[PDB]
Design a protein around this ligand. Structure first.
Ligand SMILES: Nc1nc2c(ncn2[C@@H]2O[C@H](CO)[C@@H](OP(=O)(O)O)[C@H]2O)c(=O)[nH]1
Ligand SMILES: [Ca+2]
Length: 104
């Protein structure tokens, strides 16, 4: 069973922890990767009711299982905060335009 399901993409808790660790490391070092500069601030315009405090940062999680290093980030993202706490897993899949919906 999937711990998080983003459209057709299936992720386990370890998939998320691994992606999150990479994104947080970059955040701590003040570095970014890719043309859209990840990780970067996630404003939560969608208004998700996250259990942890802001600020939030978004970082791509790939269905291939690899850690994001550049190029297309796909539709999925892990959202973490300043204390490296997982806020949630979100996706562009099933959402209009560049909006997000939560992975179930
Ligand atoms: N939909 C949405 N986009 C956000 C939010 N906060 C920041 N963004 C940025 O606006 C764009 C929406 O897809 C993305 O930038 P990026 O394309 O540079 O990665 C995304 O990172 C938010 O809360 N909602
Ligand atoms: Ca996996």
């Amino acid at each position: 069973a999937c711990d998080y399901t983003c459209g057709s993409n299936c992720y386990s808790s370890s998939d998320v922890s691994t992606a999150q660790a990479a994104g947080y490391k970059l955040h701590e070092d003040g570095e970014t990767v890719g043309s859209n500069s990840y990780p970067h601030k996630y404003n939560n315009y969608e208004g998700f009711d996250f259990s942890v405090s802001s600020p939030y940062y978004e970082w791509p999680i790939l269905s291939s299982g690899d850690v994001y290093s550049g190029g297309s980030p796909g539709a999925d993202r892990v959202v973490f905060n300043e204390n490296n706490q997982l806020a949630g897993v979100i996706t562009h899949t099933g959402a209009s335009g560049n909006n997000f919906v939560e992975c179930t």
